[PDB]
Amino acid sequence: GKSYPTVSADYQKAVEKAKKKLRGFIAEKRCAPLMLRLAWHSAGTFDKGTKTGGPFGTIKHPAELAHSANNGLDIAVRLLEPLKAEFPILSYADFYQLAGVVAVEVTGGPEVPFHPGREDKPEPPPEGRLPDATKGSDHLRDVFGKAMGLTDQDIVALSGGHTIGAAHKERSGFEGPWTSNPLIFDNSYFTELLSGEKEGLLQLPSDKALLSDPVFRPLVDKYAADEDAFFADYAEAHQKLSELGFAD
Amino acid sequence: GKSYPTVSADYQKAVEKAKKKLRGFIAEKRCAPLMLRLAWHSAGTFDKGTKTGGPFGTIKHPAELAHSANNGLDIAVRLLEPLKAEFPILSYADFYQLAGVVAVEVTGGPEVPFHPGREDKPEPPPEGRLPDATKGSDHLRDVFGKAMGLTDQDIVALSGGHTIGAAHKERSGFEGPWTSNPLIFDNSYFTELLSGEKEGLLQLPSDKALLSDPVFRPLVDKYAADEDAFFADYAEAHQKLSELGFAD
Ligand code: HEM
Ligand code: HEM
Numbered sequence: 001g002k003s004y005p006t007v008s009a010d011y012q013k014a015v016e017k018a019k020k021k022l023r024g025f026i027a028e029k030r031c032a033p034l035m036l037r038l039a040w041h042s043a044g045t046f047d048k049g050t051k052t053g054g055p056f057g058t059i060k061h062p063a064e065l066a067h068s069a070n071n072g073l074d075i076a077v078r079l080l081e082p083l084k085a086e087f088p089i090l091s092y093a094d095f096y097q098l099a100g101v102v103a104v105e106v107t108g109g110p111e112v113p114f115h116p117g118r119e120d121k122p123e124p125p126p127e128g129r130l131p132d133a134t135k136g137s138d139h140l141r142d143v144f145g146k147a148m149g150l151t152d153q154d155i156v157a158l159s160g161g162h163t164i165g166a167a168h169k170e171r172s173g174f175e176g177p178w179t180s181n182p183l184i185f186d187n188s189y190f191t192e193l194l195s196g197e198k199e200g201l202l203q204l205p206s207d208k209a210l211l212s213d214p215v216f217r218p219l220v221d222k223y224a225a226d227e228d229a230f231f232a233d234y235a236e237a238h239q240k241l242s243e244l245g246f247a248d
Numbered sequence: 249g250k251s252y253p254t255v256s257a258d259y260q261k262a263v264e265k266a267k268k269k270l271r272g273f274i275a276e277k278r279c280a281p282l283m284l285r286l287a288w289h290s291a292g293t294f295d296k297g298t299k300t301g302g303p304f305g306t307i308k309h310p311a312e313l314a315h316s317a318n319n320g321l322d323i324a325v326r327l328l329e330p331l332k333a334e335f336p337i338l339s340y341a342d343f344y345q346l347a348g349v350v351a352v353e354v355t356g357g358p359e360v361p362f363h364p365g366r367e368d369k370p371e372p373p374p375e376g377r378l379p380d381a382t383k384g385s386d387h388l389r390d391v392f393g394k395a396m397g398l399t400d401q402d403i404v405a406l407s408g409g410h411t412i413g414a415a416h417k418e419r420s421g422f423e424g425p426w427t428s429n430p431l432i433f434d435n436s437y438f439t440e441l442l443s444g445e446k447e448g449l450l451q452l453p454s455d456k457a458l459l460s461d462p463v464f465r466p467l468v469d470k471y472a473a474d475e476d477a478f479f480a481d482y483a484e485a486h487q488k489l490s491e492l493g494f495a496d
């Protein structure tokens with residue numbers, strides 16, 4: 001239920017130019033997964049009951065980067081600082097979410113609609129709102145549902161974001177890619193999740209929780225059979241996540 | 249601006265009986281300062297922008313007792329558990345605030361009006377909202393003013409709560425009483441604050457901040473000259489603090 005704010009023509013021109021520069025930079029640096037993870041951890045702190053947190057640029061604060069769930073995301077902030085400085089008119093909030101949208105696009109994923117106008121806010125949210133990889137469906141619903149206000153369909157679709165990238169034992173402690181093609185955005189996360197553990201590939205307990213839940217599991221089966229349907233629901237869910245607490 | 253909830257006659261009878269039992273117990277155990285500090289740290293987590301936190305019984309949770317600002321308050325919770333069990337109808341929130349009101353009364357202080365009907369809530373607030381003793385007036389206003397929504401007069405009056413009790417090097421790290429009579433509720437905190445450091449008595453940086461601020465300092469002078477005026481403003485401020493986020 002969104003009402004997007006008006007931004008000047010110069011702001012809109014800067015979005016379009018930054019989008020292109022982000023494509024080139026993210027593709028060349030091979031950091032699309034990290035950038036997706038930065039945008040998601042930015043937005044995923046939203047609490048709908050208090051309207052605190054969410055995608056309002058606070059993740060660049062050292063206080064929020066120190067959160068253990070954000071281990072490694074200081075690399076992302078640093079990687080983007082030279083480009084952000086070329087687009088001073090843009091908020092950090094818009095810039096990081098635009099980077100997440102581009103991360104998905106440049107790895108072959110759906111084109112997530114983007115609307116500008118997030119304002120940078122000065123206080124990071126409390127630590128502890130991001131999901132815990134060792135937990136299961138109840139915990140997923142607590143975080144995405146009770147806090148962020150996303151649907152069970154969004155949970156499954158957004159979990160397929162793991163179709164790009166890898167864990168790092170020096171960041172979370174988990175290690176390895178979810179897929180055999182970690183810079184390619186496709187439905188492979190779901191086909192691997194269904195096939196069992198393969199050697200070399202990662203499954204978190206929070207991934208496996210999707211297989212045993214009666215609402216999540218049919219979605220997993222849908223996305224593994226129908227990549228177009230995964231792309232549609234993913235684009236819906238990403239857009240919602242990127243706009244949590246914004247333009248309501 | 250309060251609208252107090254209706255409670256049954258049995259609840260009201262239990263308040264009155266617990267008030268008496270609290271007087272006897274707190275007087276005998278010599279723990280009025282700790283009990284005041286428990287009630288204040290319960291209520292002082294209130295944030296008026298989000299309506300989170302405040303005096304709703306969450307301080308008995310191990311998660312909130314672990315907060316470093318609450319070092320030692322597990323002693324208080326434990327001390328009160330046998331009495332609370334004699335009054336099962338009462339919420340923990342009402343019981344702890346009633347204990348704070350009695351702590352003030354039984355050490356000779358003003359009779360703070362008490363209204364029942366706080367409901368126990370299940371989530372403790374985030375850590376870090378209670379004031380920092382090494383900081384000054386700006387920090388006091390951030391905490392009491394911007395979060396809790398109390399006035400500068402309340403800040404000074406409520407700081408005179410230090411007229412009873414002591415710091416402990418194994419809890420905060422500070423050590424000693426503010427006053428020569430730490431179980432007597434009087435204006436002595438302000439007369440000591442004005443006289444300078446005396447040997448054996450404690451002044452926190454947050455106490456000393458009251459002397460250098462142009463709004464706080466006249467209040468300090470008022471309370472040190474006029475204990476009746478301290479008692480009046482204290483009773484006002486304590487009642488407000490004990491009712492933050494309650495019955496609005
Ligand atoms: C469902 C609950 C989730 C849990 C428990 C979880 C947990 C994790 C963990 C532990 C890592 C490894 C971090 C590291 O060690 O480098 C990770 C990586 C990643 N996460 Fe999630 N995550 C969840 C949901 C999401 C969502 C909703 C998105 C985006 C839509 C996402 C995108 C990513 C990406 C792209 C990576 C790889 C990052 C890289 O390669 O640097 N995750 N996640
Ligand atoms: C103004 C900002 C405040 C700061 C920075 C502060 C800080 C502290 C500290 C560090 C201690 C010592 C804890 C220990 O080591 O045992 C303490 C004790 C105490 N505080 Fe405060 N406090 C403040 C306000 C308040 C308020 C508003 C009240 C109640 C109205 C209060 C009541 C007490 C009492 C009664 C004690 C003594 C506790 C005991 O003897 O066990 N304080 N405070």
Ligand SMILES: O=C1O[C@H]([C@@H](O)CO)C(O)=C1O
Nearest residue numbers: 029030031032033034035165
């Ligand atoms: O997605 C990522 O990009 C870098 C690296 O893989 C390529 O630069 C990294 O640290 C990430 O987790």
Ligand SMILES: O=C1O[C@H]([C@@H](O)CO)C(O)=C1O
Nearest residue numbers: 277278279280281282283413
């Ligand atoms: O106010 C207090 O009561 C006890 C003790 O002084 C008397 O029991 C203590 O640990 C407190 O800080």
Ligand SMILES: [K+]
Nearest residue numbers: 163179181184
């Ligand atoms: K993939």
Ligand SMILES: [K+]
Nearest residue numbers: 411427429432
């Ligand atoms: K005293």
